[PDB]
Design a protein around this ligand. Structure first.
Ligand SMILES: Nc1ncnc2c1ncn2[C@@H]1O[C@H](CSCC[C@H](N)C(=O)O)[C@@H](O)[C@H]1O
Ligand SMILES: Nc1ncnc2c1ncn2[C@@H]1O[C@H](CSCC[C@H](N)C(=O)O)[C@@H](O)[C@H]1O
Ligand code: NI
Ligand code: NI
Lengths: 222, 222
């Protein structure tokens, strides 16, 4: 047999949200506003995927988190709220307009002391962190920015992760396009190439969760 | 918007397995044999769901695991292989025929020292564990036996879990039947009632993963 997983219909999907999604009112408000104010609202993290991220922070008791791709800060705040008392999260983006709203909401959430915005190319922020002796220091890294650079960000995130640290990568399924070998758009070929790379990568243990637009988890092995 | 998750088609599902499923040959062999020898083969844990369980053992560095519902021992071995050097897993079932094959395979896997079979009603094994001072001692409990007793097993698993411990429950989606409020079969109403109970339970943080027949994760809060 196989299929061996119960596939989601719109019916089943809605039921799942009804018995699982516990969105904090502040985050709910944050995406109502993101929808209202940003034409790019759709690149926002799925409430259910973010909730899984929050659960991972708690399970690992992650004290050092990186959030690559702030936008209006949904995932940054989702994980921020799950941080233990002494935990910190730095969030990366290059867009001032969206991050300004992010700051606003994570202040309103009481996370100004835990979350710090690094406004500049993530490529640069990651290289500074390494070239400043932070390799092996991070527990959890969430990669959700420009897709062209996911391999770079992944490679850098490995260096920065402690032993047993976790990489989470969003949008690995590309709304299904990734299964169409003939789609052939630049970004689609990059993600197809990337998914095979991670699947073969013996530096990690991994899994691909069909939540949000697909969430790959890669644990850095001993 | 919403749907907010990329739903799995058979096409996408197959692609997902191709870029994520890393089944150990021994486990592959175990389910070929289970299919061949057991008319009840279908209640076996999905390779991809088991793989997620293995990843959770590693992330938590779980040293004490319970496996409720051995069958031919797929999940017991999947998690067993991920156990740290000093980790142990006890597996529960009442069926001698299937557990005998389980023993055989987890010996062949080199896990005879880590896995211990408790052959008797899980209800009894769990009560012994508690009535013998093991409350708060376990890291991860996987509930996958008789569905009529999932609430009982859940309730007992909370007592046995350490702070920050994890309950994993399989078959919460019931191949979709659970979304049909008018299905009404005894077991379907029990799981619908259970899913709402967990969703409302403030003793845990939870998430429902659409992998296998649905996997609910509930972390015991501080
Ligand atoms: N070179 C770069 N460095 C940092 N951020 C970048 C970048 N290129 C694009 N981005 C940002 O990556 C973001 C993609 S979407 C962000 C999603 C976010 N996790 C959420 O919860 O909503 C955009 O905000 C975009 O501005
Ligand atoms: N009261 C009970 N106590 C313990 N096990 C029980 C039980 N009632 C049913 N079971 C067992 O629960 C199992 C259900 S299926 C087991 C799935 C297993 N996790 C795997 O990886 O394949 C059956 O083997 C059945 O024998
Ligand atoms: Ni995204
Ligand atoms: Ni099952």
């Amino acid at each position: 047999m196989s299929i061996n997983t119960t596939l989601l219909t719109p019916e089943l999907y809605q039921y799942l949200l009804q018995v699982s999604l516990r969105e904090p009112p502040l985050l709910a408000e944050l995406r109502e506003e993101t929808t209202r104010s940003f034409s790019t609202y759709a690149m926002q993290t799925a409430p259910e995927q973010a909730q899984l991220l929050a659960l991972l922070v708690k399970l690992m008791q992650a004290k050092k988190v990186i959030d690559i791709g702030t936008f209006t800060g949904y995932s940054a705040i989702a994980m921020g709220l799950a941080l233990p008392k002494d935990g910190t999260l730095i969030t990366c983006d290059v867009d001032e307009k969206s991050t300004a709203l992010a700051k606003e909401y994570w202040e309103k959430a009481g996370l100004s002391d835990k979350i710090g915005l690094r406004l500049s190319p993530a490529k640069d922020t990651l290289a500074e962190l390494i070239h400043a002796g932070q390799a092996w220091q991070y527990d959890l890294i969430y990669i959700d920015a420009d897709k062209a650079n996911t391999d770079l960000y992944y490679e850098e995130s490995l260096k920065l992760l402690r032993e047993g640290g976790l990489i989470a990568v969003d949008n690995v399924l590309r709304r299904g396009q990734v299964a169409d070998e003939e789609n052939q758009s630049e970004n689609n070929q990059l993600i197809r190439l990337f998914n095979q790379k991670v699947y073969k990568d013996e530096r990690v243990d991994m899994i691909l969760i069909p939540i949000g637009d697909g969430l790959t988890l890669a644990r850095k092995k001993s």
